[model samples]
Target: IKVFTTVDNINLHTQVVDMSMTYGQQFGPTYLDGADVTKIKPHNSHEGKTFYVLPNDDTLRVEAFEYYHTTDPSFLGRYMSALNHTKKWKYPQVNGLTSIKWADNNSYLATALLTLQQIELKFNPPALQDAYYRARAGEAANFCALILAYCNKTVGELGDVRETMSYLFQHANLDSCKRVLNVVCKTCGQQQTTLKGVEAVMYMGTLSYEQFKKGVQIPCTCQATKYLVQQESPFVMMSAPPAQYELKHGTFTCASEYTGNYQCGHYKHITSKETLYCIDGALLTKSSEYKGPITDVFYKENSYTTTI
Candidate 1:
């Protein structure tokens, strides 16, 4: 669990005290260590808070964060709020562009909290920024999704990506300047592997960017990339960011127990973990609950390499 807010921080002087969203049950803030993040206490301000309960998997924590928070900030809904919208709260104070830079950090969340804090530090106090970013965790999660999608684009975004200098140039405005842009760039001019049969394609479905980032262990389909474009608003929320990077180490869980498989063992670009095999590490199949392209050998460590 990641304590994205400053309320229960371990490090970082920029920490802000966190507030509990557990209904009207008021309580004082408590300090939390990394271990304390996973071990919630009784009468704890985090009693109902979820940051401590999610699986500590690499990118899965992002998915867990979304269960309670709003990674997809309804910028479109709020930007065009002359009409009464059905979903997404309207944040009038939440305006203007906020640009952020990353260095392929291990935690996807670090970028988010930084952005949330950034807007707070420059744009507004916790009142409007928090109402816009923290309450639903918008600035944190939405930027997280957008950054991920931006890093994963084909014609344009992020890993082995030449220049990692991307920005969040636009917020709730029209897309005239495409400056905050990022992409994996170029394209799959050809196939990576020699085709065998139609069985190559499986489990054709779209998992949210959160799920896609988890690196499906028993994946049943091939993963592809498509995200972001010019003339599009910065509010575009999705997970197809055009980049790849390392995350913290966490074992995959099964039946409430630890599995030998590591979370980053495999990812969306041809992610196939289900019923795969490896003949003495010679094929692209899952044999030891491993998830990765043949170029990757997932055993120990938090980082792994993959194709675009």
Candidate 2:
């Protein structure tokens, strides 16, 4: 088999002509044959039919066609230079649909899908397995889940994890998405009852936009969720260092939203890591064997003042 190489055509003769030359009074065809304006027509063939002379408005197309067909090194040199100067993104790609709109997220997803399709085209299941033979079961599982999420996100039906996984397995071209789900689910011992298990399945689901919106937040196995139920602490508690403050030459006060009675005590339970007690209206840092005077104690008030 022979590989085709790109022909570099960056050397061509080119020039810029004034737009007015074709339609201007000095060289305009209409002025040449004034009485028979209809007799004037385009010199270049369009679709197949050719006309005599040239239309004034067809200058841009004629110039464009000439530019495209250029073989002269100088013409192509400037043309390529200008084209390179106009470059945007990584490279220009043909997106045929004119009316379609894609945001950054959608564009990235589309690119990923296209890449996966190419990969599928080049490799079979055994080939991929041989390539990733060193990968751990957990890593493989995560990759599967990620692909599932991508599928769901792409189709906009990301919400129902079970159905999505099932759908992925059923799709002929999307077997890789299904394989990931199968391997990860088996390794994780995830069942439908647990959200983590369901999430594993959902990982392969080819979702629609609405389903994705709903299903994207579906949780999976992780330590943060294991401990907090959510990823953050839900408790409302606050503390400050140096609890005591002596009045100088000005008024002094303290305030608190903790409206309950101050509970102060300590216990040395064997199971407990350490004692936690409140003293002088502050949570004690560590257990103390001896008790202290009430001078350290302060009461919370809506407002309070000391004359010193």
Candidate 3:
């Protein structure tokens, strides 16, 4: 007779089952780790016998069976279909200029124009000056558009449109200036009242050189005289002229005498016996002629005696 134990049947079942044995072991640790024992009991004759074992392995088998039984393959197909549809949807191209909005482009242009204007004001090179004027010419259309959108008058009603057009034609070119003038005439022709030429001319003349000179010459009074007085007392005295004296001839008879009498004969001689006097009254008297004679001379007597 054949006999089967619970452990022998479990080992036999593991080899026969197609499911993962390791997965079967995940149901409970007690099922694999507890004491192994087996018993065979007869049931009905049709059912035959049942094997019972300590620490059931049936729990692990049931878990593994349920995991396999609930899985569906159709979910993977639905996920892949959604991913493909997203990939095919339309998107903006990186290289296209249309990707940038018109308002954004306009904002960028305005910022560039402001920077250019500032550079023109500060540094003002000739090339930049030309570029600034060209930009102004180009901006005429925008200016006209703004005025037309905001203004509620016909050009004639607003002011003298023809006169303004004529003035602009005289001063500016036919391109942008004329275009702006056309816009102005169409938009403002029927509004309130036209500006007068005389008034305009007078306003313009106020900015001229003659007007500036007239402003400078506006009536004023001398307030300086009321605040200040004439300074009568001199701060410094005038210097006096040097004294003058008449030239006079003089002779010196003593150290105290500076001028002499005319009779002193210009100069005093020691041997001539001339009298010298000070013109201011100091005087010393002496003989006017020489006392020694020519015959008493020794050289004259010797010449006469030798000739005899």
> Best by TM-score, which number?
1
- Please tell me which model should have the higher lDDT, number 1 or number 2: 1
User: lDDT of all the models against the reference?
Assistant: 0.25, 0.23, 0.21
**Compared with the true structure, what per-residue lDDT tens digits does model 3 show for residues 129-172?**
33345445442222221122122222112222223222322222
- Which candidate do you rate higher for TM-score, 1 or 2? 1
How do the residues 256-288 of candidate 1 rate in per-residue lDDT, one tens digit apiece? 011122433222212212332222111222333
lDDT of 3: 0.21
Residue 101 lDDT in model 2? 22
* Candidate 3 vs. true structure, TM-score: 0.13
What is the Cα-based lDDT of residue 183 in candidate 2? 12
Provide the RMSD of all predictions against the true structure, rounded to 1 decimal. Answer: 20.2, 27.3, 59.0
TM-score of 1: 0.18
lDDT tens per residue, model 2, 43-152: 33221221122223345334433423322333322322222322211221212101102322222222222222212222222212322221122122222223333233
Give per-residue lDDT, candidate 1, residue 222. Answer: 36
- The lowest-lDDT stretch of 10 consecutive residues in candidate 3 is 296-305
Better of 2 and 3 by TM-score: 2
**Model 1 worst lDDT run, 10 consecutive residues:** 251-260
* TM-score to native of every candidate shown: 0.18, 0.15, 0.13
